Ligand binder design. Structure first.
Ligand SMILES: Nc1nc2c(ncn2[C@@H]2O[C@H](COP(=O)(O)OP(=O)(O)OP(=O)(O)O)[C@@H](O)[C@H]2O)c(=O)[nH]1
Ligand SMILES: Nc1ncnc2c1ncn2[C@@H]1O[C@H](CSCC[C@H](N)C(=O)O)[C@@H](O)[C@H]1O
Lengths: 284, 255, 255, 255
RNA sequence: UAAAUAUAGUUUAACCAAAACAUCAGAUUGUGAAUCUGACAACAGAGGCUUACGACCCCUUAUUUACCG
């Protein structure tokens, strides 16, 4: 590719540019069809190396630090096998959740509204969100609805989980949540809903739209809910928090941690602990 | 009731044995802590007052136990209850193919010496001491309580030696109860699950929370005081004989 | 302790159930006698004072148990303990070749309906009432104690129907204990042996005295009071859950 | 099928071990009689053809078993099945009040060593030899069959030592099955009761002929060939693992 | 309408420049796994400029405050 015609002086020009690039990275560079977009991507691609080597340099510096102390310097009940035992324990709990647990739906029908940066970030929040469900005392039955098998979102999920994808204790499906559940019990959670969520209802299916629009697109989740006949609710952030800073649309890992706290009889004081403290000045 | 009874509690300087002694002495009974000399038994016996004394002895030695039983007769005049809480735990895989490591036989023998062999050594000797007692209104001469573990039913990976020793205690509880039935001595066994003994509490807080969460209900490690409560219930109830009671909060240990 | 606790004892007009109510009420608790209308529980409830009330209900019917628990809620305001002592028995061989007699399916179904179905019916409805209670300092909402004799393990000749029902109670003790673990309800099972219930005192002295002598120690039929003592011990011990306790004096039933 | 398999039969010079070797060799397998030098196993090995060899070794001795296992490696190349059948017994009671007799400690130690420690000694050493085998189509490297007794559940009077060792085998059969699960080795336990072995001929004939009538059905002594048939069944079934199989003709041992 | 702001796991720090705590996959861990090997690292967004940068300038959405001779 001739796209090297930009990089090979942009390094000499004085802008921050990474030294190691591949054709796969080079391909995504040419979709950036403006000077600022290319500069923004190159800045991201440059800082990837910057924290890599800095953390790289840290780790073998530690290797010398421990190898000198490790080489120079009884009755037990259990073998030290806890990480294996914890994973098995969460597996049994997840298997029980898939049968009797309350369903929670992550709507994957937002692939067409996301750029590559946003789509990748959605998976990262999805990975953390499902991780917190596993470690909970009373896990949800997590559903991935509207997830196209060949779609971009599915391929990214497979790449991140690798072998674990086929072994996850969650129900991923092509069908919409309206096909799996009665339309009366579905409550599409969205920040733009005019109805404020008062109490957590254990006989309802809460739908979270897996949409991370860093280029914020208000009303997208509400439009989907009103395109169907689904009811909507919004978190009582204004009721219990003194907001000052930032968007009121929380991340997927914060949302699931708020719902999990509510499901475990926690009040709104404990549940809203997971709203970033940088966005408000205390609970009232 | 347990007031006026004399209890010999092997391994009574710590853990379940110490909790049993504290409750029985508090309820009005007298206790003899039979533990190793290196343990803090002397301090514990002093803390419990004049109704509790410390008899240093190794349960694996016949001579040591007989001297301890003589001490109980000297101080209190008779033996009414024997509680066998002394025991050690060893975690070791039977064979590890990747590491080429085979379970050491001496590891198996020492666990069997203290848990299984030590328990029976106390039982055969303390039974003769209760055989000198005049039967009460019910015709009973004494109560013998052994401490097995849940590993006797679902042992985990690396508990081959521990489960075998504890499984043997479950094995002997009925035949010994049959042996001592003419005499009038009851034999019972308690199988505690995960308990807040110094063995478990010394573990990192990360794994302590996990072990507590594994118990269905209550989701916490067993209080040693709860073991003491069940020991008293067996003593007071005349119709409990030759039975293993699991005190584990319905936990079934995973591999 | 059990003071202030509200206990619903099924089959409390006679036998093990009545003995449990006398001990619990005598210890300061309140008891709701749930039994058949013709069982004479009203006379027993009057004898036990104002802390004991009789609720006539058939455990095999969901309607009667719901009204009985509504009466327990009305009189005392809450339910804390459920003791399933209601039970019947049938002595009939599965098949007699010398007589050409086959076990009647109505007899097998009748025993299961009261012993097995009635126990679960009480459990499933009572768990709704303990679910309304606020968890205590230990997080416990209630205790359920089931009765399932040693016939569940070593049944005798002609006890197939009775062992099937009691084997069912033993088998389902753990799954129900795991079911109610999130709620905070402990499910425990007692396996009484030969007890001096009005059933055993009815049969002639020949089999009565012989069976009493077949118990290793004590060589007598179990006092129903001793059953009540172990029932109270389970209530007071927070760590007893999902376990079957044999209360038989170490007797193993021969064919 | 068992054709071509190499089996190390512990205590295979008489009783259950000899019957197991007799059946497996007849079916086309190879056997190694691991028994004491004075047991007369050399005659048994010769009678069974060139497919059977005698390895004189004491199960309590680590050196003896390693040489015996190395002999099987030299003669046959691999070890596929291990059957632990060697065991001794003692008829001493725990304590006799009338005679002032106490179960001597050495009798309990000697029975425990051969039965419990000896079984584990063979298990851990044969696990290394089985770990060298290539996993078959089902991923299995070998099968280890242990011989407990019915006394592990309902041991009689004067069987405290025997029940302890047999209870230990039942106790550790699951942890060892869990320990060896990644390797691909199945551990199963058989609990025979009253078999026509030399053990059931040392006892007085009138007593022995009476026990044959105690078995519900078949009302006789167990044929050692029936034990050999069950061992072959366990070998050929890939899903039998970690379980204790009672083979007693539905007998429950009275006190 | 105007000014302040806007960290997509969370905080801190900021012309320091990357941390600390977390997250995902693999691990049969001999009790420092208190680790190792990998995965992901975008300071609202889209554009302009500038040798450059997080700076500077329009624009979009949003948040908090104020808002008529
Ligand atoms: N002073 C003042 N003016 C306000 C306030 N809110 C709205 N306005 C005025 O209302 C205007 C609304 O702008 P727009 O939202 O573009 O107006 P619109 O008529 O809704 O047009 P579209 O956005 O195209 O739908 C603002 O630009 C101000 O002139 C307020 O709080 N204070
Ligand atoms: N304050 C809030 N109350 C309820 N749900 C919220 C919320 N904030 C975020 N969510 C949920 O979290 C998900 C990602 S936030 C993104 C929402 C979407 N881009 C929009 O503009 O409307 C959404 O599906 C939304 O349902």
């Amino acid at each position: 590719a001739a796209t090297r015609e930009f990089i090979e002086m942009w390094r000499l020009l004085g802008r921050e540019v990474p030294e190691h690039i591949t054709e796969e990275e080079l391909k995504t560079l040419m979709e950036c069809v403006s000077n600022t977009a290319k500069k923004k991507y190159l800045k991201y691609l440059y800082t990837k190396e910057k924290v890599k080597k800095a953390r790289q340099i840290k780790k073998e510096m530690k290797a010398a630090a421990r190898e000198e102390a490790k080489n120079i310097k009884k009755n037990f009940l259990f073998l030290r096998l806890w990480d294996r035992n914890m994973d098995i324990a969460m597996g049994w709990k997840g298997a029980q959740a898939m049968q009797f647990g309350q369903p929670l739906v992550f709507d994957m029908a937002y692939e067409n509204y996301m750029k590559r940066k946003e789509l990748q970030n959605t998976v990262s929040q999805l990975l953390e969100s499902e991780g917190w469900n596993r470690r909970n005392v009373d896990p949800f039955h997590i559903y991935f609805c509207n997830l196209k098998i060949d779609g971009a979102l599915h391929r990214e999920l497979v790449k991140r989980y690798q072998e674990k994808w086929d072994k996850l204790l969650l129900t991923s499906t092509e069908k919409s949540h309206v096909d799996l559940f009665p339309k009366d019990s579905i409550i599409y959670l969205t920040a733009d809903s005019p109805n404020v969520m008062t109490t957590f209802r254990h006989d309802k299916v809460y739908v979270i739209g897996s949409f991370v629009d860093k280029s914020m697109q208000p009303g997208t989740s509400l439009a989907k809910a009103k395109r169907l006949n689904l009811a909507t609710e919004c978190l009582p952030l204004d009721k219990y928090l003194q907001w000052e800073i930032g968007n009121k649309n929380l991340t997927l890992d914060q949302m699931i941690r708020i719902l999990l706290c509510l499901k475990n009889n926690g009040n709104w004081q404990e549940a809203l602990q997971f709203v970033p403290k940088r966005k408000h000045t205390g609970f009232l | 009731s347990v007031k006026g009874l004399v209890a010999v509690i092997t391994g009574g300087a710590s853990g379940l044995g110490l909790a049993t002694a504290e409750r029985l002495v508090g309820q009005g009974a007298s206790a003899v802590l039979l533990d190793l000399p290196n343990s803090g038994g002397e301090a514990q016996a002093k803390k419990l007052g004049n109704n509790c004394v410390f008899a240093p002895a190794d349960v694996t030695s016949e001579k040591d136990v007989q001297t301890a039983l003589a001490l109980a007769k000297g101080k209190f005049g008779r033996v009414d209850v024997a509680v066998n809480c002394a025991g050690i735990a060893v975690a070791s895989k039977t064979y590890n193919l990747k590491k080429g490591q085979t379970h050491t036989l001496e590891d198996f023998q020492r666990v069997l010496d203290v848990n299984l062999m030590g328990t029976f050594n106390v039982i055969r000797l303390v039974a003769g001491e209760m055989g000198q007692n005049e039967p009460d209104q019910g015709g009973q001469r004494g109560v013998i309580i052994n401490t097995a573990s849940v590993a006797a039913f679902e042992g985990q990976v690396g508990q081959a030696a521990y489960s075998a020793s504890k499984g043997g205690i479950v094995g002997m509880t009925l035949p010994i109860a049959r042996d001592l039935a003419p005499i009038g001595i009851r034999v019972m066994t308690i199988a505690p699950g995960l308990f807040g003994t110094p063995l478990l509490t010394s573990l990192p807080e990360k794994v302590c929370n996990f072990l507590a969460s594994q118990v269905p209900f209550p989701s916490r490690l067993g209080d040693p005081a709860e073991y003491a409560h069940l020991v008293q219930a067996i003593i007071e109830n005349p119709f409990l004989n030759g039975e293993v009671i699991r005190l584990d909060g319905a936990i079934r240990m995973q591999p």
